Amino acid sequence: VVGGVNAEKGAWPWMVSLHWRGRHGCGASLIGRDWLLTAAHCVYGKNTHLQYWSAVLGLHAQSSMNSQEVQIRQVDRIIINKNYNRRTKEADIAMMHLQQPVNFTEWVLPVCLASEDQHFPAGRRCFIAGWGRDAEGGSLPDILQEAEVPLVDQDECQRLLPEYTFTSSMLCAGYPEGGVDSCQGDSGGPLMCLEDARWTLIGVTSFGVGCGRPERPGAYARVSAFTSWIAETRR
């Protein structure tokens, strides 16, 4: 995340770091005792020797993987949305089953998911979090970062990212002048909006042209478009 600040401990208790072969490689969101939501491109090609994965929850600093605030689980199952197209970025969304359930604590707790016609209009200020790059060309922060970014209207998303076919299963967010964005390493993590005083997961960090660039808002898989698939894959 570029243009953000250190998150406090327990700030985003659904935020998870996906370690693979011992290293953070993507983020994800806890959506229940047993299930994670992430980006498909995070798990594509890694749906084989699952013991390489470790879901790290309640994490603040990567250097403090060992705190008793931290819960860590093996990943048992990976379910990539059937419409995923790695070339076009459509349906870049997947679910991961935790091998043993997590306990809900101060530091670990699922997020509510955006519904069908819950309204999230352009201009709305939402939050992103992750352990991704500080900037395009910055370093990787030890401590989890958070930033506030505004949602951008669908038509603008597509004008600004003509390199892609921007669909109804995507959203985008960022500032015209740039400076605040999700970057490499943030993929799979959350875009969450405060809605009637309740944190709700709206997007899954998916792709972008660079990070934090002027008129290049980051793009996110739109949670509300995958409601039924998410529901059915549960447990």
Resolution of the experimental structure, in angstroms: 2.0
Q: Which of 185, 140, 184, 192 is nearest to 29 (CA)?
A: 192
DSSP 231: H
Q: Are 116 and 71 within one domain?
A: no
Q: Are 130 and 212 within one domain?
A: yes
Q: CATH code at 170?
A: 2.40.10.10
Place of tokens 């740039």: 178
Residue 190's contacts (CB-CB under 8 Å, 6 or more residues apart) are 12, 14, 15, 27, 29, 111, 127, 128, 129, 201, 203, 204, 205
In the structure encoding, which two tokens stand for residue 162, read together? 């003509």
Q: Are 3 and 58 within one domain?
A: no
Q: How many domains does the chain have?
A: 2
Q: Are 73 and 59 in contact (CB under 8 A)?
A: no
Q: Are 116 and 207 within one domain?
A: yes
Separation between Cα atoms, residue 58 and residue 172, nearest integer Å: 27
Q: Are 27 and 121 within one domain?
A: no
Could you list the residue range(s) of the whole structural domain that residue 103 is in?
A: 13-110+225-235
Residues with active-site annotation: 41, 92, 187
